Amino acid sequence: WGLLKVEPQVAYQCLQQTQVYVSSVVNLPTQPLITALEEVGIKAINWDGELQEFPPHSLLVVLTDDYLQPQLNKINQIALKANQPWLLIKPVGTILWLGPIFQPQITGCWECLAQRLRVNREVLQTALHLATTEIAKWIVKQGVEDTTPFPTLEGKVITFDQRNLDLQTHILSLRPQCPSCGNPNLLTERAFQPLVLSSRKKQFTSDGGHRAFSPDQTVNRYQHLISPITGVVTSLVRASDPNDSLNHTYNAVHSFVIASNIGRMRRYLKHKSSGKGKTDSQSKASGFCEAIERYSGVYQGDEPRISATLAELGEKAIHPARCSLFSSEQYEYREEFNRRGGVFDWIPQPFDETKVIEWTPVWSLTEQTHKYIPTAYCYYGYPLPEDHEFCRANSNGDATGNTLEEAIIQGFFEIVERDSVAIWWYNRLKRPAVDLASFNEPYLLEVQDLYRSNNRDLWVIDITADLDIPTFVAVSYLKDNKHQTILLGFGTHFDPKIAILRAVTEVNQIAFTCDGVEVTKEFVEMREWFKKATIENQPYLVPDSTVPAKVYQDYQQRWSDDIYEDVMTCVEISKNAGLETLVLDKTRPDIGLNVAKVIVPEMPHYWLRMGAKRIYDVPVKMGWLSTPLTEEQMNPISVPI
Amino acid sequence: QLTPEAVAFWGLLKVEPQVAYQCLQQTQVYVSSVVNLPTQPLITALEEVGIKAINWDGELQEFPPHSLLVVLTDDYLQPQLNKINQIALKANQPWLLIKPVGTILWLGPIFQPQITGCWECLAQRLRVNREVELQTALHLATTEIAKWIVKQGVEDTTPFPTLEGKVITFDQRNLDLQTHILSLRPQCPSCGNPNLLTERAFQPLVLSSRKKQFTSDGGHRAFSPDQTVNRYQHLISPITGVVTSLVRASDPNDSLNHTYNAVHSFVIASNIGRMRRYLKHKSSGKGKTDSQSKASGFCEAIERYSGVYQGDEPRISATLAELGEKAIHPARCSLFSSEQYEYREEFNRRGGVFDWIPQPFDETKVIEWTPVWSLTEQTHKYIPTAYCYYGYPLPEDHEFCRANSNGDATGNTLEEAIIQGFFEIVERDSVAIWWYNRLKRPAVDLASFNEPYLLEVQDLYRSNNRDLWVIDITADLDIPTFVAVSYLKDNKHQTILLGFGTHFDPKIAILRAVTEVNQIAFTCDGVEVTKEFVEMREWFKKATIENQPYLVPDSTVPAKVYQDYQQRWSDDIYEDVMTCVEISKNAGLETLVLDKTRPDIGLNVAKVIVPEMPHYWLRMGAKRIYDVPVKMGWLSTPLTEEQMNPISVPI
Ligand SMILES: [Mg+2]
Ligand SMILES: [Mg+2]
Ligand SMILES: [Mg+2]
Ligand SMILES: [Mg+2]
Ligand SMILES: [Zn+2]
Ligand SMILES: [Zn+2]
Residue B70: which CATH number? Answer: 3.40.50.720
B284 residue type, one letter: S
Neighbour-count burial of A268, counting CB atoms closer than 10 A to its CB (0-12 exposed, 13-18 middle, 19+ buried): exposed
Number of structural domains in chain B = 1
Distance from the Cα of A134 to chain B's closest Cα (Å) equals 9
Cβ contacts of B299 within 8 Å, gap of 6 or more:
B225, B228, B287, B410, B603
* Cα–Cα distance, A117 to A172 (Å, whole number): 11
Beta carbons of A147 and A76 less than 8 angstroms apart: no
* Cα–Cα distance, B511 to B453 (Å, whole number): 9
Q: Supply the Cα-derived Rg of chain B in whole angstroms.
A: 29
Three-class secondary structure assignment of A95-150: EEECCCEECCCCCCCHHHHHHHHHHHCCCCHHHHHHHHHHHHHHHHHHHCCCCCCC
Torsions phi, psi for B83 (to 5 deg): -65, -45
CA B81, B82, B83, B88 dihedral sign is positive
Torsions phi, psi for A450 (to 5 deg): -65, -45
Residue in chain B closest to A167 (alpha carbons) equals B177
Distance from the Cα of A403 to chain B's closest Cα (Å) equals 17
Neighbour-count burial of B378, counting CB atoms closer than 10 A to its CB (0-12 exposed, 13-18 middle, 19+ buried): exposed
What do you get for the CA distance between the two ends of chain B, in Å?
74
Three-class secondary structure assignment of B196-243: HHHHHHHCCCCCCCCECCCCCCCCCCCCCHHHHHHHCHHHECCCCCCE
A409 residue type, one letter: I
What is the distance in A from the centroid of ligand 1 to the CA of A617?
28
Chain B residue numbers touching A151 (CB-CB < 8 A): 173-175
What ranges in B92-164 are assigned the alpha helix state H? 119-129, 135-153
Beta carbons of B240 and B183 less than 8 angstroms apart: yes
Nearest to B172 among A93, A133, A165 (CB): A133
Domain assignment present for residue A186? The answer is no
Beta carbons of A214 and B256 less than 8 angstroms apart: yes
Cβ contacts of B155 within 8 Å, gap of 6 or more:
none
A367-370 contacts, C-beta under 8 A, 24 or more apart:
A367/A580, A368/A194, A370/A192, A370/A194, A370/A316
* Cα–Cα distance, A469 to B386 (Å, whole number): 67
Nearest to A513 by CA among A501, A498, A526: A526
User: In what helix (H) or strand (E) does residue B86 lie, and over which residues does it extend?
Assistant: helix B79-91
- A315 annotated among ligand-binding-site residues: no
* Cα–Cα distance, B419 to B569 (Å, whole number): 11
Torsions phi, psi for A451 (to 5 deg): -65, -40
Residue A335: CA count within 13 A, CB half-sphere = 0
Nearest to B139 among A94, A129, A245 (CB): A129
Nearest to A274 by CA among A262, A263, A282, A283: A283
Q: Report DSSP state, residue A386.
A: T
A51 residue type, one letter: L
The B95-98 sheet, strands edge to edge: B53-55, B28-33, B67-72, B95-98, B110-111
Distance from the Cα of A75 to chain B's closest Cα (Å) equals 27
Beta carbons of B21 and B13 less than 8 angstroms apart: no
B410 residue type, one letter: T
What ranges in A538-585 are assigned the alpha helix state H? 563-576
Dihedral of the alpha carbons of B182, B184, B190, B191, in degrees to the nearest 10: 120
B275 residue type, one letter: M
A272 residue type, one letter: K
Residue B508: CA count within 13 A, CB half-sphere = 17
What are the b/e assignments for A531-556, b being 16+ CB within 10 Å? eebeeeebebbbbeeeeebbebeebe
A506-509 contacts, C-beta under 8 A, 24 or more apart:
A506/A277, A506/A474, A506/A641, A507/A458, A507/A474, A507/A475, A507/A476, A508/A248, A508/A447, A508/A451, A508/A458, A508/A476, A509/A248, A509/A250, A509/A276, A509/A277
Residue in chain A closest to B230 (alpha carbons) equals A243
User: In what helix (H) or strand (E) does residue A268 lie, and over which residues does it extend?
Assistant: none
CA angle B305, B308, B310 (to 5 degrees): 120
* Cα–Cα distance, B557 to B99 (Å, whole number): 70
Cβ contacts of A364 within 8 Å, gap of 6 or more:
A370, A371, A580, A581, A582
DSSP A159-213: EEETTTTEEEEEE----TT-TTTS-TTHHHHHHHSPP-----B----SSSSS-SS
Domain assignment present for residue A31? The answer is yes
Q: Which residues of B are annotated as a binding site?
A: 118, 121, 188, 191, 300, 303, 424
Beta carbons of B475 and B467 less than 8 angstroms apart: no
Beta carbons of A187 and A303 less than 8 angstroms apart: yes
* Cα–Cα distance, A103 to A114 (Å, whole number): 16
Is there a contact between B8 and A124 if contact means CB atoms under 8 Å apart?
A: yes
Instruction: Name the structure determination technique.
Output: cryo-EM
Cβ contacts of B593 within 8 Å, gap of 6 or more:
B205, B372, B373, B374, B375, B418, B421, B606, B607, B608, B609
Cβ contacts of B11 within 8 Å, gap of 6 or more:
none
- A181 annotated among ligand-binding-site residues: yes
Nearest to B325 by CA among B363, B382, B387, B388: B382
* Cα–Cα distance, A351 to A387 (Å, whole number): 10
Using CA atoms, how far residue A198 sits from A366, A406, A563, B576, in Å, is 17, 11, 9, 58
* Cα–Cα distance, A399 to B372 (Å, whole number): 61
* Cα–Cα distance, A400 to A407 (Å, whole number): 5
Residues in chain A: 641
B71 three-class SS = strand
Pairing of strands B67-72, B28-33: parallel
Cβ contacts of B375 within 8 Å, gap of 6 or more:
B205, B577, B581, B591, B592, B593
Beta carbons of B166 and B116 less than 8 angstroms apart: no
Nearest to B592 by CA among B618, B573, B567, B610: B610
Q: What share of chain A is helix, strand, coil (3-state, %, to 5)?
A: 35, 15, 50
Domain assignment present for residue A533? The answer is yes
Q: Which residue of A90, A163, A443 is the best one to mutate when testing the B interface, meaning the one whose CB has the most B CBs within 10 A?
A: A163
Q: Report DSSP state, residue A578.
A: T
Nearest to B390 by CA among B306, B469, B325: B306
Beta carbons of B12 and A162 less than 8 angstroms apart: yes
Neighbour-count burial of B29, counting CB atoms closer than 10 A to its CB (0-12 exposed, 13-18 middle, 19+ buried): buried
CA angle A171, A175, A181 (to 5 degrees): 110
Residue in chain B closest to A129 (alpha carbons) equals B136
Q: Report DSSP state, residue A153.
A: -
Beta carbons of B606 and B405 less than 8 angstroms apart: no
- Name the packing angle between helices A404-426 and A563-576 (round to 10°): 40
Nearest to A89 by CA among A54, A132, A58: A132
Using CA atoms, how far residue B263 sits from B181, B238, B248, in Å, is 19, 12, 6
Residues A202 and A58 in one domain: no
Structural domain boundaries enclosing A162: 10-171
User: In what helix (H) or strand (E) does residue A217 lie, and over which residues does it extend?
Assistant: helix A215-221
Is there a contact between B214 and A244 if contact means CB atoms under 8 Å apart?
A: yes
Ramachandran assignment for B490, one of left (phi > 0), alpha (psi -120 to 50 degrees), beta (any other): left
Chain B residue numbers touching A247 (CB-CB < 8 A): 216-217
What ranges in A314-461 are assigned the alpha helix state H? 320-324, 328-332, 334-340, 404-426, 442-453
Q: Report DSSP state, residue B123.
A: H
What ranges in A297-397 are assigned the alpha helix state H? 310-313, 320-324, 328-332, 334-340
Beta carbons of B316 and B365 less than 8 angstroms apart: no
* Cα–Cα distance, B527 to B282 (Å, whole number): 15
B155 three-class SS = coil
Nearest to A440 by CA among B10, B71, B456, B267: B456
Beta carbons of B90 and B208 less than 8 angstroms apart: no
Chain A residue numbers touching B49 (CB-CB < 8 A): none
Pairing of strands B104-106, B95-98: unpaired
Q: Please tell me what resolution, in angstroms, this structure has.
A: 3.1
The number of beta carbons lying within 10 Å of the beta carbon of residue A362 is 23
User: In what helix (H) or strand (E) does residue B79 lie, and over which residues does it extend?
Assistant: helix B79-91
Beta carbons of B163 and B96 less than 8 angstroms apart: yes
* Cα–Cα distance, B413 to B210 (Å, whole number): 9
Domain assignment present for residue A146? The answer is yes
Residues A25 and A100 in one domain: yes
Dihedral of the alpha carbons of B108, B113, B115, B120, in degrees to the nearest 10: 50
* Cα–Cα distance, A135 to A34 (Å, whole number): 12
Q: Report DSSP state, residue A574.
A: H
Nearest to A592 by CA among A103, A223, A261: A223
Pairing of strands A19-24, A58-63: parallel
Beta carbons of A391 and A324 less than 8 angstroms apart: yes
Q: Which residues is A462 bridged to in the sheet?
A: A472
* Cα–Cα distance, A99 to A101 (Å, whole number): 7
Domain assignment present for residue A177? The answer is no
* Cα–Cα distance, A240 to A510 (Å, whole number): 13
What is the distance in A from the centroid of ligand 3 to the CA of A250?
29
What is the distance in A from the centroid of ligand 3 to the CA of B209?
26
Q: Please enumerate residues of A whose Cβ is less than 8 A from a Cβ of B.
A: 3-5, 93-94, 98, 124-126, 129-130, 133-134, 137, 151, 153, 158, 160, 162-167, 169, 204, 206-208, 214, 216-217, 220, 243-247, 280-281, 440-442
CA A252, A254, A255, A256 dihedral sign is positive
Residues A328 and A399 in one domain: yes
The number of beta carbons lying within 10 Å of the beta carbon of residue A67 is 19
Beta carbons of B608 and B418 less than 8 angstroms apart: yes
Neighbour-count burial of B470, counting CB atoms closer than 10 A to its CB (0-12 exposed, 13-18 middle, 19+ buried): buried
The B104-106 sheet, strands edge to edge: B104-106, B166-171, B176-181
- Farthest-apart Cα atoms in chain B, separation: 99
A490 three-class SS = strand
Residues A505 and A580 in one domain: yes
B40 residue type, one letter: Q
Is there a contact between B256 and A280 if contact means CB atoms under 8 Å apart?
A: yes
- Ligand lying nearest the CA atom of residue B82: 6
Beta carbons of A154 and A206 less than 8 angstroms apart: no
Beta carbons of B408 and B597 less than 8 angstroms apart: no
A564-569 contacts, C-beta under 8 A, 24 or more apart:
A564/A197, A564/A198, A564/A199, A564/A200, A564/A405, A565/A199, A566/A210, A566/A405, A566/A409, A566/A494, A567/A197, A567/A365, A567/A405, A567/A408, A567/A409
B277 three-class SS = helix
Q: Supply the Cα-derived Rg of chain A in whole angstroms.
A: 28
What is the distance in A from the centroid of ligand 1 to the CA of A508?
14
Domain assignment present for residue B469? The answer is no
* Cα–Cα distance, B504 to B567 (Å, whole number): 7
Q: Which residues is A361 bridged to in the sheet?
A: A372
A563 three-class SS = helix
Q: What share of chain B is helix, strand, coil (3-state, %, to 5)?
A: 35, 15, 50
* Cα–Cα distance, B401 to B334 (Å, whole number): 7
Domain assignment present for residue B72? The answer is yes
Distance from the Cα of A580 to chain B's closest Cα (Å) equals 37
Cβ contacts of B199 within 8 Å, gap of 6 or more:
none
Nearest to B385 by CA among B515, B517, B201: B201
Beta carbons of B496 and B486 less than 8 angstroms apart: yes
Neighbour-count burial of B115, counting CB atoms closer than 10 A to its CB (0-12 exposed, 13-18 middle, 19+ buried): exposed
Nearest to A125 among B139, B224, B460 (CB): B139
Distance from the Cα of A503 to chain B's closest Cα (Å) equals 20
Distance of alpha carbon B269 from its chain centroid, rounded? 14
